[PDB]
Amino acid sequence: QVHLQESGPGLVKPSETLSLTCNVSGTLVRDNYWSWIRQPLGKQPEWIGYVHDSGDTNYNPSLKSRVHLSLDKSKNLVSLRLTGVTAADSAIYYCATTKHGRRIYGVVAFKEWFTYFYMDVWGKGTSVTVSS
Amino acid sequence: TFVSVAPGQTARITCGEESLGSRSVIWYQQRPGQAPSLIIYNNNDRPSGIPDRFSGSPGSTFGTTATLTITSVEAGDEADYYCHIWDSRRPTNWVFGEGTTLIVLS
Amino acid sequence: IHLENVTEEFNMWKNNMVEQMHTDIISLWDQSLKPCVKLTPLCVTLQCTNVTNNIGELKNCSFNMTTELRDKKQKVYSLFYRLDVVQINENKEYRLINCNTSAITQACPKVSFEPIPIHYCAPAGFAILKCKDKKFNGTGPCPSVSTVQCTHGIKPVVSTQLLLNGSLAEEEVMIRSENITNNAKNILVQFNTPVQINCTRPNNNTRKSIRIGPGQWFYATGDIIGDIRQAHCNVSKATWNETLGKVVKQLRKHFGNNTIIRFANSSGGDLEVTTHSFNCGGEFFYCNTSGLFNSTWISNNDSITLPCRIKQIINMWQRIGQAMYAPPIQGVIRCVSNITGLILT
Amino acid sequence: NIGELKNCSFNMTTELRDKKQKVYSLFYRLDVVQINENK
Ligand SMILES: *[C@@H]1O[C@H](CO)[C@@H](O[C@@H]2O[C@H](CO)[C@@H](O[C@@H]3O[C@H](CO[C@H]4O[C@H](CO)[C@@H](O)[C@H](O)[C@@H]4O)[C@@H](O)[C@H](O[C@H]4O[C@H](CO)[C@@H](O)[C@H](O)[C@@H]4O[C@H]4O[C@H](CO)[C@@H](O)[C@H](O)[C@@H]4O)[C@@H]3O)[C@H](O)[C@H]2NC(C)=O)[C@H](O)[C@H]1NC(C)=O
Ligand SMILES: *[C@@H]1O[C@H](CO)[C@@H](O[C@@H]2O[C@H](CO)[C@@H](O[C@@H]3O[C@H](CO[C@H]4O[C@H](CO)[C@@H](O)[C@H](O)[C@@H]4O)[C@@H](O)[C@H](O[C@H]4O[C@H](CO)[C@@H](O)[C@H](O)[C@@H]4O)[C@@H]3O)[C@H](O)[C@H]2NC(C)=O)[C@H](O)[C@H]1NC(C)=O
Ligand SMILES: *[C@@H]1O[C@H](CO)[C@@H](O[C@@H]2O[C@H](CO)[C@@H](O[C@@H]3O[C@H](CO)[C@@H](O)[C@H](O[C@H]4O[C@H](CO)[C@@H](O)[C@H](O)[C@@H]4O)[C@@H]3O)[C@H](O)[C@H]2NC(C)=O)[C@H](O)[C@H]1NC(C)=O
Ligand SMILES: *[C@@H]1O[C@H](CO)[C@@H](O[C@@H]2O[C@H](CO)[C@@H](O[C@@H]3O[C@H](CO)[C@@H](O)[C@H](O)[C@@H]3O)[C@H](O)[C@H]2NC(C)=O)[C@H](O)[C@H]1NC(C)=O
Ligand SMILES: CC(=O)N[C@@H]1[C@@H](O)[C@H](O[C@@H]2O[C@H](CO)[C@@H](O)[C@H](O)[C@H]2NC(C)=O)[C@@H](CO)O[C@H]1O
Ligand SMILES: *[C@@H]1O[C@H](CO)[C@@H](O[C@@H]2O[C@H](CO)[C@@H](O)[C@H](O)[C@H]2NC(C)=O)[C@H](O)[C@H]1NC(C)=O
Ligand SMILES: CC(=O)N[C@@H]1[C@@H](O)[C@H](O)[C@@H](CO)O[C@H]1O
Ligand SMILES: CC(=O)N[C@@H]1[C@@H](O)[C@H](O)[C@@H](CO)O[C@H]1O
Ligand SMILES: CC(=O)N[C@@H]1[C@@H](O)[C@H](O)[C@@H](CO)O[C@H]1O
Ligand SMILES: CC(=O)N[C@@H]1[C@@H](O)[C@H](O)[C@@H](CO)O[C@H]1O
Ligand SMILES: *[C@@H]1O[C@H](CO)[C@@H](O)[C@H](O)[C@H]1NC(C)=O
Ligand SMILES: *[C@@H]1O[C@H](CO)[C@@H](O)[C@H](O)[C@H]1NC(C)=O
Ligand SMILES: *[C@@H]1O[C@H](CO)[C@@H](O)[C@H](O)[C@H]1NC(C)=O
Ligand SMILES: *[C@@H]1O[C@H](CO)[C@@H](O)[C@H](O)[C@H]1NC(C)=O
User: What is the DSSP letter of C327?
Assistant: First the structure.
């Protein structure tokens, strides 16, 4: 059983850079695809982005210029760096193990297919607000 | 948005907008205080540990929204049901669709 | 009538029966469009964007159209293939690609152009002589001759690179040319076996009609149900390779028994001369075909998938000023043909 | 200097029904009549 342990201060100043860590145990962070999700209170979850290796990463376009993801295989940790934090970024942040599947709708040779993602392993989440 | 279900009754949960193209719906149930937990992926694939009472609508249709049927609802199934949707004719959704609270009337 | 002890000289390159078939097909094609609604009223400026999909073959365009009353206007939008639309304002502004050159006429949706076989019959005072020589090469003396009043039924199939619904050679692949050695001439190859080709337009389309005047209707593509996919053709791979092997064995008769034969794809130019094209299901398909001519044959189940493009405004007989517009076809198109031969240079 | 040909301009159609062009050309006076008895 993989244990995902989200951690951070729980409070970051406005107009500040936020850095959260997911301590991964029971698996190697480099072999899995990792993703971050956040859930503002009263809202459905939002994806932040995903990270793995070989350039295969992606970001929520609204956060693309603000978020940087990284996996440190020597610590077996997933890092989440979000800059420019404001009140709107108050959310529970979650660490999850993401699996990738494929759906084919056309000819294949014409790339008429797509990859889809789902999250099998979830942490507990870390509640982080933004406040003076 | 919620559905009121007496224990043993079937929940009828919907999520998202109408399909344009081939779709892959992934459903999660989030119990209060918990991270969302995956129940269905790829429209009707249930990961090991997920009961057969959880059954999703097909992605072969168009003009339809996602639907989740939960039969024999138990008190332990009380959760917020959210969906993430992939659609060949729409841009990637980086967010979840608004969910439905499943309230068990026990 | 078999003609005992009768021989005659034939020349398929000087055969005026061909000339009439050509002349008459064109005349009927044109006659069939005479009662149909003209689309010259559609030469308007269109505002246009892409058709929604996830990430552009199809264009989503809109314009200010006339109505049943001359003093009224309506907003009309429709789906177009990009191949029929040209950008002018280098939404962006576009015009139909043929408004600077031709009148465009909508084909009546009720009239079929299916290549129904017909027989050609001689008038009184005339007779048609025919060959029974299975090895006849389209020219010179024909050792076995018989006569008929009427030819067999011939399907007026219109195509470019491949012949999809003709006759097969009686015994062996026959290769005929006016000269073979003259590089200015074509070589026609008649297969002695069919090759199955399966073509489709894998998009469930809808159509709507627009009243643009007094009983004047325009048929517009509505939208696409489900996924948007490219048109294509499936050619039996094993069959195709066996077929080419036979063609090469026969081609070598004029090039040398150990001469290497290579099949390369087409030269550049307009789709009507660089691609394989056909009319099926009412749509005009243009297929890349390079997957069929990509091999070298040296002396001593699966399929080939060919992407295809679709156009609606067709300069059917390679003439200028007379364009036909193919109204949208609803549903999904599936066509199966017999490749019976090739035109090679 | 000190009238057979006239320089007439007008609002002409183009290949598109939404566009207009200013066109001028020469005409012989025998083919043209004044209506507003540039004129
Ligand atoms: C020229 O030749 C090529 C090559 O054969 C041919 O391409 C093929 O076209 C077909 C067109 O339908 C494509 O078919 C799709 O394939 C995907 C993937 O296949 C899976 O299932 C098969 C079953 O035996 C397995 O063998 C294979 O390994 C995979 O597991 C299917 O998933 C598609 O069906 C689903 O999606 C459709 C999308 O609209 C739905 O309509 C359909 O009902 C299915 O969805 C539903 O059932 C699923 C079952 O598990 C479920 O998961 C879904 O959520 C949903 O409920 C479909 O079969 C095929 O892949 C193409 N192959 C390639 C390599 O291109 C060309 O079409 C052909 N052209 C001509 C002119 O003939
Ligand atoms: C090379 O030669 C082959 C073989 O002759 C041609 O292929 C055939 O082409 C015809 C003409 O397009 C095809 O017939 C079409 O079938 C469509 C669907 O019919 C279904 O339902 C009938 C009911 O009895 C069944 O018999 C049939 O099998 C199908 O199940 C029709 O919709 C088509 O037109 C009719 O409906 C439309 C609807 O609006 C009307 O507008 C029309 O007037 C008409 O009523 C038509 O009948 C036939 O299926 C083709 N066969 C194959 C194997 O493809 C090739 O097209 C030809 N090659 C080329 C390039 O032309
Ligand atoms: C809607 O459109 C978007 C944009 O087109 C599309 O997202 C794209 O999906 C492709 C994959 O299908 C992503 O491509 C990745 O790019 C990284 C960069 O190096 C690669 O490493 C990835 O490799 C994976 O797939 C390979 C396939 O052979 C595997 O071999 C390899 O091991 C990896 O599994 C992959 O190429 C592309 O970056 C995204 N782009 C964006 C902006 O998301 C989206 O999925 C479409 N959605 C639907 C429903 O159609
Ligand atoms: C581009 O393609 C679309 C269809 O694929 C063309 O039609 C447009 O479709 C959208 C979605 O169905 C229509 O939006 C509608 O808005 C009303 C607002 O209250 C809403 O109630 C409906 O449920 C729907 O969302 C849109 O109006 C419709 N456009 C027209 C003119 O009917 C679109 O026109 C195409 N664009 C071009 C330039 O061709
Ligand atoms: C059957 C017949 O008449 N074939 C013609 C060829 O003979 C003719 O051949 C050309 O003859 C020229 C005479 O000087 C040669 O220079 C030329 O290389 C030669 N070309 C070929 C392909 O043999 C060709 C082309 O003029 O036309 C045939 O119809
Ligand atoms: C074109 O479509 C036809 C119809 O599906 C294909 O013919 C079938 O091929 C399968 C292959 O095992 C046979 O089992 C079926 O019995 C065939 N149908 C009939 C009616 O004979 C045909 O092969 C396709 N051609 C190509 C090139 O894919
Ligand atoms: C139906 C339609 O598109 N009509 C537009 C009109 O709305 C627009 O205001 C005008 C120029 O501003 O050009 C017309 O073609
Ligand atoms: C409507 C249209 O396509 N007009 C074309 C123009 O785009 C093309 O550039 C020119 C020759 O290049 O010939 C015109 O007929
Ligand atoms: C039917 C036939 O074979 N016709 C001619 C033959 O008469 C001629 O002698 C030869 C070249 O000499 O070219 C063949 O095509
Ligand atoms: C090409 C041409 O004549 N255009 C004129 C325009 O210059 C004039 O301003 C307008 C009325 O004022 O009437 C148009 O026909
Ligand atoms: C076929 O597709 C290839 C892809 O590179 C293209 O280069 C070629 O010109 C195409 N053939 C035709 C006839 O368009
Ligand atoms: C088609 O021709 C190109 C030319 O280099 C070749 O690379 C390609 O592999 C050929 N296609 C196939 C299927 O071999
Ligand atoms: C296209 O979608 C309509 C929706 O009702 C359906 O009835 C029709 O049969 C579909 N056509 C094809 C070829 O799937
Ligand atoms: C191909 O020719 C054979 C000859 O009998 C015929 O039966 C078959 O239906 C033809 N197929 C097509 C697709 O025309």
Answer: P
**How far is residue A55's CA from residue A76's CA, in Å, rounded to a whole number?**
18
- Angle (CA) B90 B36 A35, round 5°: 65
In what helix (H) or strand (E) does residue C25 lie, and over which residues does it extend?
helix C16-32
Side-chain-side CA neighbours of C152 within 13 Å: the count stands at 6
Which residues in chain A are contacts of C307 at CB distance < 8 A? 110
- Hey, what amino acid is at A29? V
If one counts every other C-beta atom within 10 angstroms of the C-beta of residue B44, the result is 15
Secondary structure class of C273 (helix, strand, coil): helix
- C12, C47, C138 from C141: Cα distances, Å: 12, 63, 9
Strand C216-225 and strand C295-297: the pairing is unpaired
Q: Resolution to 1 decimal, in Å?
A: 4.4
Do A and C make contact, counting contact as 3+ CB pairs within 8 angstroms? yes
Those residues whose C-beta lies under 8 Å from the C-beta of residue C207, and which sit 6 or more positions away, are: C219, C220, C221, C222, C327, C328, C329, C330
**Residue C271: helix, strand or coil by DSSP?**
helix
Q: Which of A56, A62, A63, A108 to mutate to test the pocket of ligand 3 (most atoms within 8 A of CB)?
A: A56
Three-state DSSP state, C150:
strand
Tally of CB atoms within 10 A around C232: 22
Q: How many CB atoms lie within 10 A of CB C226?
A: 20
- B→A contacts (Cβ < 8 Å), by residue, are 21-22, 24, 26, 28, 30, 34-38, 41-42, 47, 59, 80, 82, 84, 86, 88, 94-99
Annotate A40-67 with b (16+ C-beta within 10 A) or e (fewer).
eeeebbbbbbbbbeeeebbbbeebeebb
Task: Tell which one of C85, C90, C99, C100 to mutate to probe ligand 8, the residue whose CB is within 8 A of the most ligand atoms.
Answer: C100
Question: How many CA atoms within 13 Å lie on the side-chain side of C210?
Answer: 24
DSSP, res B93:
P
B102, B11 contact by CB (below 8 A): yes
- Way the structure was solved: cryo-EM
